[PDB]
Amino acid sequence: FNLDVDSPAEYSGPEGSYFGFAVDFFVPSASSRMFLLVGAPKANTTQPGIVEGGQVLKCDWSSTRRCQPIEFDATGNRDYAKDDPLEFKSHQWFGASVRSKQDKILACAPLYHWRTEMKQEREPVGTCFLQDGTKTVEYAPCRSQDIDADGQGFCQGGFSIDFTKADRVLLGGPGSFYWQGQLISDQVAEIVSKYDPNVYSIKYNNQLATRTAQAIFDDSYLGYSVAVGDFNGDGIDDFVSGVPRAARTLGMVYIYDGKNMSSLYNFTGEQMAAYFGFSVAATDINGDDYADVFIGAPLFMDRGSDGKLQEVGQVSVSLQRASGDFQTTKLNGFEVFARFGSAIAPLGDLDQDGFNDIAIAAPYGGEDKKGIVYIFNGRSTGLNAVPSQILEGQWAARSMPPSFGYSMKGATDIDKNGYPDLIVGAFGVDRAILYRARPVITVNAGLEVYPSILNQDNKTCSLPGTALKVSCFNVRFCLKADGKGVLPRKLNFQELLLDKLKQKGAIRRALFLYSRSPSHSKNMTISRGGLMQCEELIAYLRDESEFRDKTPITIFMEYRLDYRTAADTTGLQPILNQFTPANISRQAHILLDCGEDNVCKPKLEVSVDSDQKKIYIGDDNPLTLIVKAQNQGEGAYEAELIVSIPLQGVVRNNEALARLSCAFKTENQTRQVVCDLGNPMKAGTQLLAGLRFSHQQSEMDTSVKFDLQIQSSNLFDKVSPVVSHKVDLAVLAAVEIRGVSSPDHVFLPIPNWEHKENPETEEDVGPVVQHIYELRNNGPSSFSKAMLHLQWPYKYNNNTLLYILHYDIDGPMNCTSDMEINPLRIKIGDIHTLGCGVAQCLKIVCQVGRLDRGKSAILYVKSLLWTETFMNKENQNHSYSLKSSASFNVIEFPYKNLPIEDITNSTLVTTNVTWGIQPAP
Amino acid sequence: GPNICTTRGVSSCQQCLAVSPMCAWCSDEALPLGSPRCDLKENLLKDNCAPESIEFPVSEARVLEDRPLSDKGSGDSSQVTQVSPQRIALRLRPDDSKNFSIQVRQVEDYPVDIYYLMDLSYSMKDDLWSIQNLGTKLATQMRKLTSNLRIGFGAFVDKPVSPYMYISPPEALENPCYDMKTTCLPMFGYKHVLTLTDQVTRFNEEVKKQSVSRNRDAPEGGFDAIMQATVCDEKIGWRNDASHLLVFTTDAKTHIALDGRLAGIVQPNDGQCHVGSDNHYSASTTMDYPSLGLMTEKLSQKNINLIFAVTENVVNLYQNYSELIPGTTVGVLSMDSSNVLQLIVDAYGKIRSKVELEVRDLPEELLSFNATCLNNEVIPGLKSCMGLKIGDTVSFSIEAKVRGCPQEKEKSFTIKPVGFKDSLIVQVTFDCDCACQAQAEPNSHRCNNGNGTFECGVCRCGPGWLGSQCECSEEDYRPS
Ligand SMILES: CC(C)[C@H]1C(=O)N[C@@H](CCCNC(=N)N)C(=O)NCC(=O)N[C@H](CC(=O)O)C(=O)N[C@H](Cc2ccccc2)C(=O)N1C
Fold this sequence. Notes:
Strand content of chain A: 35-45%
Bound molecules: the ligand CC(C)[C@H]1C(=O)N[C@@H](CCCNC(=N)N)C(=O)NCC(=O)N[C@H](CC(=O)O)C(=O)N[C@H](Cc2ccccc2)C(=O)N1C
Protein name (chain A): Integrin alpha-V
Membrane topology (chain A): Single-pass type I membrane protein
Radius of gyration of chain B: 38 Å
Oligomer: heterodimer
CATH class of the largest domain in chain A: Mainly Beta
Number of strands of chain A: 69
Strand content of chain B: 15-25%
Number of domains of chain B: 2
Family (chain A): Belongs to the integrin alpha chain family.
Number of helices of chain B: 10
Subcellular location (chain A): Cell membrane; Cell junction, Focal adhesion
GO molecular function (chain A): coreceptor activity; extracellular matrix binding; extracellular matrix protein binding; fibronectin binding; integrin binding; metal ion binding; opsonin binding; protease binding
Largest interface: A-B, 51 and 31 residues
Shape of chain B: rod-shaped
Number of helices of chain A: 4
Structural class of chain A: mainly beta
Number of domains of chain A: 5
């Protein structure tokens, strides 16, 4: 968020020149122009007879991004005697270390080789060139009469380089004293004063330097990296130096007093060959007056996820706590073979609202191993051990790794932003980059609704247009902005929403009165330095009249900054502070009835009853249902009565029950009826409604289980007792039989009839007599099988009464006679009663199948009136009623365990025979 | 009663035998013709069709040659035998199976590769006999433990650049030891000398022909030699199957990564092979020393066990280095080669081997192995035991279940443990045929010119034909 990772300035040098190996800032006190310093230790120079003698380029900012060599010298080697040069300046690595302070530039060539005045030789004493204005001079403290490797020969002086406060150079030669390394410190004034080009062992009077230690300290490379800070309290910059090979290659960092080079404190690494000390930096990262030391171990190996080691690197931060005591944390790397900790560049105040910050580099990590850098901000407790930003390389290896971040330098403001910018070296591509730091805008926010906890809507506000009176609550929100850097006085912004839960597809609820919308946005200008600026809004509350929408309601907003309009004239753009959230919300809640508790216990009861308690299923039965419910708790807020229904209105007819609206549906196969008591249902307001369902044909099934349960708004399961109705499976089984006769009566004598010896035709016997019997179901119950019988008078006084010929059948039934029908094989005076109880009986026995509502079975019989029995002398003038009867009963029903009923109905029909032509008196 | 044999149909002896091995074919008049010839064995035995007229094959798994597995690898007493039986004959049926055992023993010695890096800086001139004796006994004692050995050669001094080497007088540039009034060779870097070869005498006698150089700073650049010996497989000649060991010699401290900054060498090591046509490490003066993590990665990636042979004065430093190189060990480079030969023996004692079975020439018609491994784990399913050692035994079992009858009678298939000089083959052979119709009598006049198949004594007539010789017609056959 801090550093600009877009459009960073790039500087390029000659191919293979290692341009960018060492970097720094140039700060002339003579003029206001700022310059970068970049070292190219392998650049070919215009010197006579020198091959890649090194270079240092003053890279401007900014006309054309040009990098110009600094003419430290314009001469090749020099002669001690003819054909006996004292100096070998090819492959000397001039620019391996560059450092500046005010008008002074100090650059060194660690690999400059000279021939000792005492012998013919080539020793890399290393040499430095110091510029102070146009007065360039050469500083070579290791070139001396201490000649061999045992002394300052191979000193490689200028390998590591830094100034101090006031003016006193610190120089580190890792090669001195058989690579023990050493530090040398001198006054810049004395370095300039004692220079004459004709002396090769110049001595400086106020020099402080370390000295030969025991041989056991050889190959320690003391001075591999150096830094200065005050750690004793005298107010003079003390010397801190990295010793990457010390203590059996564990690595040590030495601290030396800045006024007499006495040893103050010693640090030790913990992992062999990690190179603990490859880079060091002294900074106070917690706001104190005391300076803390940082140390790099790029090759640190720690146990990984799978339990195996892995070179990730780390940085160890030792805070300084006013007594000489140090409390040390550690900061491990994040990638394998990235060498995290190669460079440590103090920035300071990069988090302008805070304490000193530090950057740490891993030049062989990132994508494609193009290099990466980590930014860590400091806090009063110490360092923010989680990275705050990421920068990584943007070029391909040619042919060596780009090594982005191999060397860096911060703590300088080139573009006058007010806080340090950062320079990154990528010498593998012969490039170095400049990263500018962005200005931080800090915004604090808050929104309030003092009418919070609205209880009654209080509809008073005029709805726009229609002028309807509606409810409301006041909503307002404010912000305040500040920033330490140079950023415009015209900061610009653009939103606020009426709900957070409803964002998932749901009903609309409230709206902003004049906006008619659930959310809004409107731009404003803040000016970067004022008190909270804001205004309030008017909300059209909704709803309980059309949306049944009283869980709480949330108010929420965020602020829309735009960086484009606030961009700095130099091309940069401001940024918002990292940890200030864009989200802010206040919800409270809304109250209508229930008591002052979070549960508002919905203790309630429901009961049901059935109008007809035995079902009688034979049709769309009038079945009716009665329900009631009551409230004993704080109240039901969503008192929806749900009722399940079998596979199977009207009740509004009367005011017998407390009727109220219901509904029905079968969503997801859950057949149900929905009836509402209230939203909320008023406390202590019990009710009773009633209900009706009414064809069913399932066999041996009694699964009707109407039940109740009431819904509410309570947060817990609020399951009310599930009371259900009851009905028994029973059916009525009414059945009856009826019949008719034709003719009903007859008058004798029969027309043109006379006695017979033996009859064979119908008219020989007499007129035809026919009876019809009809059986039909009456009750809902349907039987499986049934039987019926006919009773017929056959003979009386040894004479035939009625002579049956045949019978016909309609419907599901069959018949058979108990005596031979048509035995003679005929070709097809008050009333006295005859029948099976007096006359000889004839019976027809019949079986029947299933009958049902409206279904019938009919039996027909045809017979002849035996005229002889009533026309013979002894029977003349007689009258008889030859009636017949029928009866039936059920024998089986389609169920066994269910209730059963029988029948006893019967019917008789008339048939009268009389004499019409009677003798005269 | 036959549940299968007769109910699937009967046409001929060959088709009858095409049914599962539960069935047989009868060809005699010893019983009434109440059922076809393919009645099940339970019916065959009791109804008892003539013994001489029963076609009932039985699969035969018989050793063709089984030379027992040798318990010694010495050539003076054996040619070694690693898998048995070498060949088993198998008589088979198109739907039958039979057990077939097989056994394996690791007898031949494990192949080893010992490469030997030399420290040839002037520091070593005081105890060069130590390193030479070590190089000699590395070969001589390993020939006393394994007969499959290959040894190589290499040397390292330091990067031929300042401040490591004397560039100052032209005399020093070709004789660094000039300043001491003594002669020594110019500095190498790292140069491969002798590729891995089995000729002990050449390496043993050619070790003595190397001599020292001189550099300035006490640390020596041996890690470059480690990295190049590991990653230059061609020049070194590492062998894929062999156990790889790398012995590294040094008397002084070591240049670790990032020490090349003093010489202007700021390119990280990359682990590629850079040994040139002249057998010199071309990038010696262009690439920094390698990192311990990179060395460990490349050392495990190519299965190398590294043994530090260092003097008494740096044992602790390299031990502490060892723990950062997981799996590495270290020993004293004393005058006597002890304590580094022990590490070599110990390394040999831990190279366990695998016994995997592969098959070739196997037709599609024929089982997956069930492997019995060491410690008497008789696990089904698994077919490749691991963690075996010379002198141990592992047993496998398989049965030759059949899927059908192939085009012709004779086939074979070969089994071979992977990497073993031994193998076995089975001359699998399938008896799908029948001897009844081989007599060429069928379709003669005795079968009414082909109205029936001759059962080697009686003609099996087709539909509409009847009689022992098919001399009668079923349509015309009537009671009389
Ligand atoms: C004691 C001396 C005989 C010994 C030695 O190690 N001297 C030290 C300096 C100690 C003082 N340090 C200071 N800061 N004042 C030293 O120079 N170390 C580096 C080196 O010499 N490296 C070379 C590499 C090489 O050429 O192989 C090598 O090993 N030098 C000789 C080796 C030797 C000496 C005597 C007999 C056989 C071999 C060495 O060890 N020293 C000079």
